[PDB]
Structures are given as structure tokens and as C-alpha cells.
Amino acid sequence: KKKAIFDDFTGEDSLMEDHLELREKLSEDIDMIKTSLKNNLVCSTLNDNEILTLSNYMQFFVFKSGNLVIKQGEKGSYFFIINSGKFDVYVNDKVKTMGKGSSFGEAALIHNTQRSATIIAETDGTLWGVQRSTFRATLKQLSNRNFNENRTFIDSVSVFDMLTEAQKNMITNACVIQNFKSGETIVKQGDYGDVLYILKEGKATVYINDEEIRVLEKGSYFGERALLYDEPRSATIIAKEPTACASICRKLLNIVLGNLQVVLFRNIMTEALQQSEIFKQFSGDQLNDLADTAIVRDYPANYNILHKDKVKSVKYIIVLEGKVELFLDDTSIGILSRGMSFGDQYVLNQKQPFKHTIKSLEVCKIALITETCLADCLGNNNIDASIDYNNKKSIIKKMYIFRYLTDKQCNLLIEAFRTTRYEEGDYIIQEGEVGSRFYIIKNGEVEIVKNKKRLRTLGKNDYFGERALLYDEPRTASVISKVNNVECWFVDKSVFLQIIQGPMLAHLEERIKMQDTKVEMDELETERIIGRFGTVKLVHHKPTKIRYALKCVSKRSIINLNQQNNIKLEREITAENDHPFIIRLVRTFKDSKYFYFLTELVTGGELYDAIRKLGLLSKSQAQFYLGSIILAIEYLHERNIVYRDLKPENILLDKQGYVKLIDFGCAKKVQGRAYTLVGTPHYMAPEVILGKGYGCTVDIWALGICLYEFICGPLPFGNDEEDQLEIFRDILTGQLTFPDYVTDTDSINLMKRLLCRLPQGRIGCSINGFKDIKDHPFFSNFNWDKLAGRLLDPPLVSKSETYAEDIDF
């Protein structure tokens, strides 16, 4: 017995196939398409070469009088431009009538949507047409290939060599394509240059003092200096044939990157310090400090920069430009070029005399690091204390339980650690006893043994015994010293509980208990339904009496919608999330008919109901909720996740009034530029709509939409609009205004900078990342440490609980 095969070959797409005819395009055809697309909502930002390519994908369609083109209520896919004849319209089976030059079905280019009108042909007329799939696919291909071409051209430009991978990708998105006709001047001699040009196609002639010097082709570039200095152009460059250039202006580069020269030297110094066996062990913040504080100096060629015994405060040097030679008395040790460095032994032993000599081999630039520079940046006169301090800090800043404590709290915790020794065979912890110490291995190896079964071996910088800080319980496993000379850092529970305060302790006490509880489906009892894909049940775990949420999703509903890859990806993202303001997944389950997600139960209600109870937010209330979202979003962007559906509906409050981001169905791990149109229209960024690619920046746009809601009340774009097209039009072209009762300069500026249409110029989307938002004057009185450390009073704490109402899982 064999199954038959069976739909979707009888829509409006199949109707257009019947009317399709072949037609070679004339000059009258292309020009007529170019004009209609340039006036259209999606294509008005596009250049001529993109519009020309799109214009070639237009198909020709022929209609006799009485033939239906579009019917009302049918799902729409094509966009049309009337080539000849008249076409009547029926608004609710009744309105307009339009002929050559006009267009319709614009919304179809963006999204699959029901047709408003129904257009019948009045006379023997013809249409130019294109389908959504082809249109979006074409924009995707134009943008992707443009970016990749421009990226490999950036790699050939030597002034950008010391940019990082992320920084090069950033400046690639700052490239503007510029097309030039034959005989057109690209740059003129004596003009003050602020633009770097790279030839993509064509040829240009270089003239100096009216004399023909040379010809530039694909891959040639000029104006490197124009990105650094403000000087006269050295030559006049005129296009010889039709020519395309990628250009980057200094103005946009300074927005994207800041001072290019500063960034390059910072990167050289930062990479040099990361090769040092001493400077390796310090944090990125400390290395950026050393880089930003180092004395930078130029020296001439064949110059003794440092000479045995005559050196005073200088302990370390990094070559930024040129070359120097390192000597010990008369013996040559080596040549240091860009990014190489010297002085480890003098950094470690700052009182010992300088015995080396550094002589320049050519004109050079050097970064000098002194005793004062080290003390100020590494925060101590003693270097071994600093190293020791940061070794502990690095380890605890990775752990959930310590990393959201404040800098004061974290510093008190680090100072409290003491050292103890153990020999081969010693039990550091014995299974059974009630523990009270947390351990970090400084030197040696230890075995973890649970119920006589070796679980794993831990070594230098691993940690154990964490739960004893939160709970008074018996120890679940023993920890035995593998070898002699084992040394641990340790801190006692009692000190941790002095440092930490009530709210944060309760958060950790609840979270770790529920996380670590091994839960089976046998052991759960449904209490009530709290959400209607599938259902969300408030469940109760009988052995521990801990309460959870259990989201159930129909396995048959997933197969029928081809969400098999998407549910795997949702699980993967939802599982990795470990942040206090993001919902925490405990476990997943699988059976014959369902996929289950078991999460923490969130009891404080929805954010969308909190803001309606509070009304328009005060500055501190808006700071609190926006700040919370910022930290959650920042967490995700650090892991290359774009959330894509940020809105108050997807944010719950916990018992304490702190927020939890939920619903990761729209989230994606970004690998390059994303193109699929996903989200809630009122919150969707313009770069999602326009279809030329996007990444993590879309969440920062939505953040500005949310802030506007909080302070002003209504949505900034499309507030009183149901129809999706008109919402999108307002997002793309509408004027951003504020009510008469919103006047706070810092609130207005932040909303304006967050709702910048160009993602490249949007606050938070430059080199400093979220730091620019966090340091914005709007947050000037806001303590980010206290937010994450649960030390702020929230705007709203609820009196009771409120709720709405193959595969490896």
C-alpha cells in the first residue's frame, strides 16, 4: 500500500502565467519602468544600477477587455505598472480608473497580503509586472554581492589593515556607490579631500597640472589620506568610460569609527599587549586604559631612545611605526617593527636598573609605558597584586552568581579570598558534610567523586562548591586532591552573605534551585492554563513543590507549517540564554504528540499592563525599564542573536518588579546580513522593510519605539492605522513628532537618535556599541551597576500573581 501525492497551483499567480507574453525591451520601455519604480515606496532609495537590474526582471502581461487582473480578498503577490489601455477599480464592488504611467499592488512587494481593491481591464491593455519572491530575491542578491565586493576592496586598502574584522565590516556598510559618466570629474586638483574612492568598474584618467599621468582601472583607489588629513587633492581624476566607485567619506567614518588614526594605534597597542605573558592576564578594559594612557612619541632615525642606566620611569615600549633595534650592551638582540614590544622583566621588577638599549633604525613612532601609567591603569603600586586580583576577577565574572554583583560588591568579594594548600589524597570536600566554602583552584588538579563514581577532573582556574553559598544542604560530591602542592583560593558563605543584599540573594536562591532540580514528566501536576501553536500550563513539581511553566507545542502543527528547522533553532537559542532579565529554560521534553519547553514561572504580570497602571512614565521609570531591556538585548547581541520582535507584549515582570524577556520565536543567530521580513509592523525597523539586509541594529530601532511609547503614550509611526502598508509608509517617510507635554531635551535627543532611519548613524550601532546609549545624558543619573545587581527600587511591584490566560529534546 502506497500513498498518493497531492495543492497551491490555482491562485492569482497561476492566472498571470496565462496572460504572460515575451517582449524584448526598448528604450521607451526601460525609461517608463525607471520612472514608476523611482516614485514607489520601496525603490525610491535605490540607485540607477539597482533599478536597471529590477527593471529587466519585469515581465509583460496582456489583457482583453473584461479580464480580471486582481480580485478583492485574494492573497496578492504581483506589483504592476500599466503599459497601455484603461483599468477600472471596484472599491467594495462599486471607484477609480487609471491608465498608462500608473502603478498598483505596491503592498505585494513587501509582504503577502489580502488585496484591498479589485482591478478589471476596461480595454485591450497591457501591464509590466513582477512577483514578490523575484523582487525580494533580486534585492537580496544585489545587496549581498555589493557588500562582499566592497568588503574585499576594503581588504586591499592598506590604511585599514590594522582594523579588526568587526570594524572592517562596519566601514563596509558605510560605502556609498557613486556612478560617473564619461568625461565626468571624480575629484579636482586643489579641492580639499574628505572621501576615499575605489573603482569597481570602468577607467579614469589621472591629471596633475593639466598633464595626463596614468589610468586607473577596477581595483584602483585614491583618497586614502583624505580620511586622515584635510589637504588639497594632489590630482584631477576624470572618468574615461562609464564608471562605478565605492566611496567612504570621513564624516560617516567618524560617526561609525571615531578618529581613524586613534583606532588604528589603539588596535596596534592592544594586540601587542595581548602577546605579552604579563599583559595577557589583564582585562580588556585595563589594556584599553594602558593604550589610551601610553605616551606616544616620534623619534628620528639612528637615535638612541633608551640607554642602559639613563632610563628612569619607562618600563615597556611598543613600536607603532618604523623600526628599532634592541641591544644589550653591544650585542644585538633583535629588530622590533610595528606591533612588537619589549620590557616584561622591567614591568615585573620596576626597581631594578634598566640594562638594555633601544636605537631607531629609521623614523619611528613609539608608545612608552611608565611606572605612573602602570599604577594608574592596573590600580596598584604592586604588580603581582594586580595580576593576582585579575586572575580571580576573570574567573568570577564568568559565573552567573557573581557577574551581576556591583563593582563595589565584586571588589569586596575578591579581597576576601584567601589561600590554602592540600596534598595528594586529601579530601577538600567530603560528600555528606554541610559545606560553607567556595573554591577556585590556583595550582594543581582535583577529582570530583559522587557516590563513588569519578565525574570529572578539574584544574587551574576551575571552581567548585558554589551551591554552599546559597543553600544549607549536604554536599552532593567529594573533591579529592590528585597531586601534591595543590593550592586553592577560598571564600566562606558568611562573607558572601555580608556583601550581597536581600533582593539579589532571593533571586539567586530561587533561580539555582529550580535550574538544578532534575525534573521528569511523571513528577508534574497541571494546576491551570495561562496561555493559548499550543498551550502554556502552570505546573507543580510534586517532590520539591517548585512551580514552573510548561509550554506545549503541537508536533503535527509544526510538520504542517515546515517549522522543523525553526523549532530546533528556537530551542538552541532559548536553552543557551542565562541572563537575569531573560526567561530561563530548565529542560525540554519530547513525546508522541508534543514538544515541551519547561521554563521558570514568571508571576509579576506583563509590562504592557504595568505601563497602563502607571500611565506615562517619569524619567527614572523609563530609565529602569529601558535600561533593563538594553542589558538583555546587549546580552543577545554579544552572542550574535538578533531578537527581531522587541515590544512590551514580550516582557513580563517577576515578583520583585524586574523584567524578563520572553518569546524567542522570531530570534535568529546572525551569519552576515539577514533578509527575511519578520516582526510586528509598528516596531519593525525601516531596513527590514526595504529588503537590502539587516542585523542586530533592528532591535535598537525597536528600543526607540518602546521609549517613545513609555514617555509620550502612543506609537510614533502608524498609531491609528490598521492597514500594514500605511504603517510601513509612516515608518519609512513619516515625520517624527512629539506631544506638547514632552520637552525634556535629553529624552527627545535619545528618541531621535534611536529612531534614525539610517542604521549606520543610529546611536548604539557604531564602534562603542551600547556604551554610547548607556553614557547618553538621558541616563546621566542612572546607576547601571545597581540595575543589574537588583539594588534599585522598581516602578511597580505587584501585590499578587497575575497571568493572561528526528529531534533531540
Side-chain angles (χ1 to χ4, degrees), residues 147-187 189-217 219-223 225-276 279-307 311-350 352-407 409-419:
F147 179 91
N148 290 328
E149 288 161 344
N150 293 354
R151 176 52 210 268
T152 73
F153 284 132
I154 293 303
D155 289 338
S156 74
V157 171
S158 64
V159 73
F160 300 136
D161 292 344
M162 297 294 92
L163 294 182
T164 66
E165 178 64 18
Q167 292 161 6
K168 284 178 166 194
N169 287 330
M170 275 193 272
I171 61 158
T172 307
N173 293 312
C175 291
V176 174
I177 301 307
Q178 220 160 307
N179 301 84
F180 294 95
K181 304 189 179 181
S182 305
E184 194 172 325
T185 299
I186 297 168
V187 296
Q189 188 178 345
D191 284 359
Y192 279 71
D194 54 17
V195 183
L196 163 66
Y197 294 93
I198 307 161
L199 268 65
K200 298 194 69 163
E201 298 296 333
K203 294 185 184 73
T205 310
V206 176
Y207 294 89
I208 293 167
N209 304 326
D210 299 332
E211 181 165 23
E212 198 184 348
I213 302 300
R214 69 200 170 107
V215 170
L216 302 178
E217 295 196 325
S220 300
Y221 75 87
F222 54 93
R225 290 176 72 94
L227 296 180
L228 302 157
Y229 321 127
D230 207 52
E231 66 182 16
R233 292 286 188 185
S234 95
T236 292
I237 307 189
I238 305 181
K240 193 167 183 175
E241 58 186 57
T243 285
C245 290
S247 54
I248 295 156
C249 53
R250 193 167 69 234
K251 198 216 167 165
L252 183 51
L253 186 66
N254 294 156
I255 291 170
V256 166
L257 228 53
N259 190 297
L260 173 63
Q261 192 58 272
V262 170
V263 173
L264 294 162
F265 288 151
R266 185 179 293 125
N267 290 352
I268 291 160
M269 288 186 265
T270 280
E271 195 187 349
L273 295 164
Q274 289 163 353
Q275 304 306 134
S276 170
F279 296 111
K280 262 183 198 166
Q281 301 180 257
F282 299 111
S283 73
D285 288 348
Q286 291 181 306
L287 298 197
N288 286 315
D289 263 33
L290 282 168
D292 295 333
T293 310
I295 295 163
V296 176
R297 288 298 179 276
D298 301 304
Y299 295 96
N302 306 319
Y303 189 92
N304 286 300
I305 299 166
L306 302 172
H307 187 277
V311 180
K312 298 288 185 158
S313 302
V314 182
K315 309 297 166 187
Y316 202 79
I317 61 102
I318 305 160
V319 182
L320 305 179
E321 290 171 0
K323 293 177 186 170
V324 308
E325 197 166 6
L326 174 61
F327 294 89
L328 186 50
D329 298 81
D330 297 329
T331 303
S332 176
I333 287 159
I335 295 168
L336 309 191
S337 48
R338 188 179 72 188
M340 301 176 64
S341 62
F342 173 77
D344 280 11
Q345 67 266 49
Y346 301 116
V347 175
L348 290 176
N349 301 286
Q350 297 179 27
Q352 296 197 139
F354 200 84
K355 283 150 197 178
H356 284 79
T357 297
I358 287 81
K359 189 170 174 167
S360 60
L361 290 164
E362 54 188 67
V363 170
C364 60
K365 190 193 252 63
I366 303 294
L368 305 173
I369 297 171
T370 63
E371 289 178 286
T372 301
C373 186
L374 292 161
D376 292 359
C377 298
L378 309 180
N380 195 320
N381 283 32
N382 197 349
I383 196 69
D384 286 288
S386 304
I387 290 159
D388 184 73
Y389 188 95
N390 199 73
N391 196 7
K392 289 178 281 172
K393 188 166 166 177
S394 300
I395 292 161
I396 70 164
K397 287 289 193 176
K398 288 174 175 184
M399 295 170 65
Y400 185 90
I401 63 163
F402 302 130
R403 73 181 188 249
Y404 303 102
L405 302 182
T406 68
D407 282 310
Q409 286 176 319
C410 186
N411 176 75
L412 290 171
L413 190 65
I414 293 160
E415 292 167 11
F417 282 94
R418 294 287 173 276
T419 172

Side-chain angles (χ1 to χ4, degrees), residues 140 144 147-148 165 169 173 569 572-573 636-637 639-644 667-670 672-676 693-696:
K140 172 177 165 175
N144 246 166
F147 179 91
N148 290 328
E165 178 64 18
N169 287 330
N173 293 312
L569 296 163
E572 194 184 333
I573 290 164
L636 296 172
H637 295 183
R639 293 146 184 77
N640 305 124
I641 292 153
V642 58
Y643 186 72
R644 296 199 296 190
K668 197 203 206 306
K669 280 178 179 173
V670 303
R673 309 166 71 80
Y675 292 90
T676 39
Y694 67 89
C696 291

Side-chain angles (χ1 to χ4, degrees), residues 602-612 614-640:
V602 182
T603 66
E606 295 226 311
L607 177 59
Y608 231 11
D609 297 335
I611 65 175
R612 277 161 174 72
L614 293 166
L616 301 179
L617 299 193
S618 76
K619 184 173 279 176
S620 78
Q621 294 174 334
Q623 282 170 346
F624 183 91
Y625 290 133
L626 199 77
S628 306
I629 293 158
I630 284 157
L631 295 182
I633 295 308
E634 183 186 18
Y635 176 89
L636 296 172
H637 295 183
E638 289 168 7
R639 293 146 184 77
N640 305 124

Side-chain angles (χ1 to χ4, degrees), residues 428-517 519-531 534-544 546-554 558-567 569-589 591 594-612 614-621:
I428 301 160
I429 292 163
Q430 181 146 16
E431 179 177 327
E433 79 198 355
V434 313
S436 73
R437 288 167 187 88
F438 164 67
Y439 292 89
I440 298 166
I441 300 160
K442 182 179 170 182
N443 300 303
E445 282 187 355
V446 303
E447 272 183 4
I448 308 296
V449 183
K450 176 174 182 165
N451 194 17
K452 306 185 165 195
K453 300 209 178 173
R454 188 190 70 79
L455 301 182
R456 65 206 134 257
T457 306
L458 301 180
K460 181 179 178 77
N461 307 323
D462 293 325
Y463 57 82
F464 59 90
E466 307 80 288
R467 278 190 65 111
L469 299 176
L470 300 176
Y471 312 107
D472 191 348
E473 58 192 13
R475 291 280 202 199
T476 40
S478 300
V479 187
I480 327 301
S481 305
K482 279 263 248 70
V483 296
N484 293 313
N485 312 314
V486 169
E487 194 170 43
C488 290
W489 287 295
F490 79 88
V491 71
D492 198 77
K493 185 172 201 146
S494 61
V495 174
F496 177 74
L497 301 171
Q498 273 164 319
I499 293 160
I500 200 169
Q501 306 187 35
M504 175 62 92
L505 187 65
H507 165 74
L508 298 167
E509 280 180 353
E510 285 190 0
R511 194 197 182 76
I512 308 315
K513 259 172 168 180
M514 64 86 60
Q515 261 176 187
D516 297 347
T517 302
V519 177
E520 301 299 330
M521 203 79 172
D522 289 283
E523 301 163 3
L524 294 170
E525 188 187 52
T526 297
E527 198 177 295
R528 49 174 274 177
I529 297 159
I530 62 172
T535 181
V536 182
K537 301 178 186 169
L538 163 41
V539 299
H540 218 106
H541 186 242
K542 294 177 193 175
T544 59
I546 296 167
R547 310 152 73 216
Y548 300 88
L550 183 67
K551 186 177 187 176
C552 320
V553 188
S554 175
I558 282 156
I559 296 158
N560 295 8
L561 299 167
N562 280 312
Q563 304 288 298
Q564 293 141 119
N565 294 320
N566 290 334
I567 197 73
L569 296 163
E570 186 185 357
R571 196 223 77 257
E572 194 184 333
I573 290 164
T574 301
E576 298 273 319
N577 288 341
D578 197 22
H579 187 273
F581 310 158
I582 297 169
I583 193 77
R584 181 50 165 165
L585 187 72
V586 180
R587 205 214 197 262
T588 68
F589 295 103
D591 75 348
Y594 286 99
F595 295 124
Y596 306 94
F597 298 77
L598 188 72
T599 65
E600 69 191 313
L601 181 66
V602 182
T603 66
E606 295 226 311
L607 177 59
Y608 231 11
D609 297 335
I611 65 175
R612 277 161 174 72
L614 293 166
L616 301 179
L617 299 193
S618 76
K619 184 173 279 176
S620 78
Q621 294 174 334

